[model samples]
Target: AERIVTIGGDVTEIAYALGAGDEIVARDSTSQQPQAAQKLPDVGYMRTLNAEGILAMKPTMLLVSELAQPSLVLTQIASSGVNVVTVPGQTTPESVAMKINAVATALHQTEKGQKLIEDYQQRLAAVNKTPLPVKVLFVMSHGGLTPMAAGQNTAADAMIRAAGGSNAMQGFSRYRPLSQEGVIASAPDLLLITTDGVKALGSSENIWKLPGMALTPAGKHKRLLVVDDMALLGFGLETPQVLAQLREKMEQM
Candidate 1:
């Protein structure tokens, strides 16, 4: 009978994966996977959420990610007496189990959550990591905003390594405005981008025009991999398959 509102894509994903989908009263804008989540009411983007919009649902629980912003709103929601639980925001493959466990516990489905963890671990372990020397770069661009490149400590970085590819970005952490010099210096063999990013750019062709993209091996050969935004970066249940696809593609390169 718990009326839950899930606030992050991964959290929503885990909730449904744990078979608690029926308990969800609403979700945030980014929880767009699994097809069914789209039918739920949206609370708005996680980062810019307003407390009133969320409280309108009369949710007994607010399952949110740590990345959901404007701390004041969270405080206000907590003050309203909803059981607000913070799920991990930034995630790696290993931490995905932790996220699943957290959501499962919140839903009081610990047994189901454990099964998901085991299934996830098994699927991940099944991936072949023969190790490719391919160097990959992950670029994020949305709504014609300036494109940024992934650096260390990013989900992109972790995914690249897990896929048996090395990250072309060596310096810095998280994302930063990609520089021409930086792109050329990194010299990636494959340009990894999300389908959403490609859509935002209007076409994958525009990706080659970014900074020093034209000068890199990836650009010269037109080596590009477009993946689902959540599948590539969300580190959800789909990550192992995404990793397998990444590794398989990098092997071809």
Candidate 2:
């Protein structure tokens, strides 16, 4: 109770939202919500974390994502007498809701979790109406020579669908590198990217130069939407707000 280290951003935010922020002695680099959570010691990237750095915090418990890669590290952490709790880490609204309840239950705050879920249900009800459904390509990163796009099962795609937008890469399963031909064929009506992605590509202008970008409707109409990677991608209390904002942006186009 006095010491907990969180791996996923949404999990960390959920902990904070439940008035357990002080218990989070450490968290991943992606846990940027609550502004105050930033002060916690960063255990590096959630995708690749080391046991030594994580163990340095002397945490009593660790809240982690089910999808955290390289399970060996988690195994070793478990061996070190630090209790590890795996939380849901999927893009589906079902998963997001489950995660809220999961985090609250793990922290022994089921009541708080129920409250958050109730509020989310209300917000989600408001978002059930689709003002417009734009075909959008969820680009995770286009800065690299081979850019990666979020496919059907990825969080980005789910968020887009939840926002009343159809995913351009709907047929694909997970995040995959985008080919020039694929981009052209996808022919998205709007481009969705996180700020971190834009920074990686040097700037938002650079995104306009991506292969086949000029041929797509997004490029023709200059429909580029940039969002805070954490807030937009993280599934927590703010997810509904993210959905509303994104829907507004898509309807504007």
Candidate 3:
């Protein structure tokens, strides 16, 4: 087989879930699931793709996410008559199901994809019925300075909602630097940050040392949760599993 190349983390994840991991010839920098795919040749980040690097792999089919970079590269590939299928990158539960469905369709595993989608729908329905919409803020980056946060309509917000929580930064249109006033106003019940991001700020001893973070309700309770960015941000079939882990963590607190 000439093999398929996935150009985004989530897209690669879906391919692996569809039992097509062996079919992947190369991956983008962010594709770090299944543990085995990490060993594949990297074509750089999806947002900063190099055409030569991708072409070097001689991939037969390219399954990419909507976020794959450099519009011109996509155009070039299309012009070359290479099969380039783009999967949408929405983060809602339904959207995650669609991603799996798309991947399965591309891999000729439509029945398996439908079964996964049905299972996710049932699990999400159970989660939604419980109504655990606590206010949460997904801090993308923090360094004892103003924190970068995901706002309304962003994938992070959709993930938070899928995990049975409300995004505290819902007022903004997309990602932005959070102001002290905004943090105070949102009064988030939980603060979410990547594990690496928390380390960058110094250490666990003072996770809330960031400027505006100290004043939020999440800060007051010291309810900071550090998670793997891929596990939380990757929109794939594993999202429901991620949500289950989040729900368990939230319930424990």
Per-model TM-score versus the true fold = 0.96, 0.93, 0.89
Q: Give the candidates in order of TM-score, highest first.
A: 1, 2, 3
Q: How much is the lDDT of residue 85 in candidate 3?
A: 86
lDDT tens per residue, model 3, 83-182: 8888887766778887887888888899988887888788767664255757888877655555587898877787777777778876677778767777
1 or 2, which is superior by TM-score? 1
Residues 107-173 of candidate 1: C-alpha lDDT, one tens digit per residue: 8899999999999999999988767889999999989788999999988999999878899999799
Candidate 1's C-alpha lDDT?
0.91
Candidate 2 has its poorest 10 consecutive residues by lDDT at: 125-134
Clashing pairs in 1: none
Stretches of candidate 3 above 4 Å error? 142-146, 199-206
| lDDT at position 75, candidate 1 | 90
Q: For residues 73-164, write the lDDT of model 2, one tens digit per residue.
A: 99999999998999988766667778888888878899988998888888887875463657888787744556688887677887888888
